């Protein structure tokens, strides 16, 4: 992402800080949520096997 000299943050949907500029070294780094999901258990009948 190209940042103007006077810009600090970024927000695509206007409530999430998508990007940020490091105060020490003036470079621009983007930020992504780590990970998450659901766990599903595929199984046949417990009567059949385990």
């Amino acid at each position, epitope marked *: 992402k190209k940042f103007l*000299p*006077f810009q600090q943050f970024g927000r695509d949907i206007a409530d999430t800080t998508d990007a940020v500029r490091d105060p020490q*070294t*003036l*470079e621009i780094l983007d930020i992504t949520p780590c990970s998450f999901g659901g766990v599903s258990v595929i199984t046949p009948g417990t009567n059949t096997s385990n």
Partner: nanobody
Amino acid sequence: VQLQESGGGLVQPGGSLRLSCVASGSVTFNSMGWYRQAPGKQRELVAQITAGGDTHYADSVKGRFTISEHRGKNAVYLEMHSLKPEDTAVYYCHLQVPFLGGGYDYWGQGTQVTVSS
């Protein structure tokens, strides 16, 4: 805020170093300049490169300090050679934003370089 400058350190006389003006974004300008200032002395213009490419050099720094500009990283560079104890100072770089016909440079931050044995 805009521009900040970092790099370099203390080196014994007879060495070399590289000073960098870390990029703070793509800005319009026409003259990237370098001074060094030491306590008890005024801010002396030591180096200056132009948008055209004119490398101004002061008489006490010719042949030892050189300027380059990297458009790929937008950053200015100063390669320093054959250091002397008179070079002990804090170094700052101005830009050439064209305010009101020209002015309001941005050397607000610099790097301390001390040359001593």
